[PDB]
Amino acid sequence: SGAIYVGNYRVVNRHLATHNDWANLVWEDSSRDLLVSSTTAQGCDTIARCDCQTGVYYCSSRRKHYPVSFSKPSLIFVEASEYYPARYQSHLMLAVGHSEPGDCGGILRCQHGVVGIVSTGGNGLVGFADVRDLLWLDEE
């Protein structure tokens, strides 16, 4: 579990979005596993605007932050689950690291701010949904 709080927006994994999130929807993309809902209180996260491929992510199943090297946002095949059928997830970045079901929502950050959130996991791999191209998150 986990979310990004930037301005009056809440960014979560689309598969973990609540009843309240859909009623307060701003934008969602099933192919990216992202949903953005509106908030009443202002958030304090800053989104990175960069092409960093190194950063640190929070792993809830280990209660630890791990430094990682990660791939550029890409269209990656993701096995069928209870949330989505087998499909191509876009804007996904992979790294060699621990991830388990329950770790989605953990933030990945670089020196410029928030890069993205944990969205997928494999045998020794972790996948992050990138948010750096969502320029509108900084305005209104």
Ligand X SMILES: COCc1ccccc1CC(=O)N1CCC[C@H](C(N)=O)C1
- 104 as an active site residue: the answer is yes
Q: How far apart are CA 12 and CA 28, in angstroms?
A: 10
* Window 86 to 105, contacts with ligand X (CB under 6 A): 89, 99-101, 103-104
Supply the minimum distance, in Å, between the C-beta of residue 137 and ligand X: 20
* Window 3 to 42, contacts with ligand X (CB under 6 A): 15, 33
Q: Is there binding between residue 112 and Zn ion (CB under 5 A)?
A: yes
Q: How far apart are CA 115 and CA 70, in angstroms?
A: 11
Q: How far apart are CA 96 and CA 100, in angstroms?
A: 13
- 133 as an active site residue: the answer is no
Pick the binder of ligand X from 119, 128, 130, 132 (CB under 6 A): 119
Q: Is there binding between residue 48 and Zn ion (CB under 5 A)?
A: yes
Which residues make up each annotated binding site for Zn(2+)? 50, 52, 110, 112
The binding site for ligand X (CB under 6 A) comprises: 15, 33, 78, 81, 83-84, 89, 99-101, 103-104, 118-122
